[PDB]
């Protein structure tokens, strides 16, 4: 059937002024900060105590929500420059049997550095993306709970992926990066979806991969990377502009906007690559340039910008609701 092409024709159900006002009010940055972010600001490379703790924190936070989230741990072993290691992607899915999902993702591992005095906690990279996904889940819980109800809607729902092993152990290389994402995209490619089908895989079921990385620095600028997601990127610009106009964003100017008209010269390697090379459409919400503090001990909580993240939470939540027609 043509169901795998439905994503090509899929349209947002755009929210009005009062609904935008409701979403903006519904998200709490101080809450996210204390309850979702802070517990992740720890060293969490693969096999570390913090890796276990982060995965426990992600799972608990999702589990407390009303929405019908089904959690799985995609755990596997790989060789690495330090010897064999275990990796565990966290996948959180509403309506696992719906043929189509909008997929949001980031990586929850932090890059290994030897202590300076100091410890690398990857605040923007990617503790904040993780927290943004968890705040989204929380803020949107009641609207997401309606997806439990079956009927007059497309066969479409939401998935969250928190990848393990995004970072290289030593120098970045095709074999020493993307442990989690290379593994999972190969698993999904080889798995029938829906169950019992012929031809189609779980990759066909991915409407759009929205990959958050390196979020939390002030005045980020996001290029529109890919023509095949450019219409969805333009929605983020429209949502940004409108929230701005309605007075719903803080410390935000039009001249200082996040989402840009221009594209990007090179090719950024990230968790989306194994999906993108197999034809999954990608909306890659990583800034250019990268934050100043990138891969530095100063990628920490103090160098994060609260209003930026708050504003980005509002824009992402609106986008997700519009996509899902909620
Ligand atoms: Zn990094």
From Swiss-Prot:
Location in or out of the cell: Secreted
Effect of residue 284 to L: Reduces activity by 87%
Outcome reported for the amino acid change (mutating residue 126 to G): Reduces activity by 96%
tRNA processing among keywords: no
Residues at which Zn(2+) binds: 125, 167, 295
GO MF annotation list: glutaminyl-peptide cyclotransferase activity; zinc ion binding
This protein's GO CC annotations: extracellular exosome; extracellular region; ficolin-1-rich granule lumen; specific granule lumen; tertiary granule lumen
Protein name: Glutaminyl-peptide cyclotransferase
Function summary: Responsible for the biosynthesis of pyroglutamyl peptides. Has a bias against acidic and tryptophan residues adjacent to the N-terminal glutaminyl residue and a lack of importance of chain length after the second residue. Also catalyzes N-terminal pyroglutamate formation. May be involved in the N-terminal pyroglutamate formation of several amyloid-related plaque-forming peptides.
EC number: 2.3.2.5
UniProt-listed Pfam families: Peptidase_M28 (PF04389)
Cysteine disulfide partners in this protein: 106-130
Stored InterPro entries: M28_QC, Peptidase_M28, QC/QCL
Chief location category: secreted
Residue numbers annotated as active site: 166 (proton acceptor), 213 (proton acceptor)
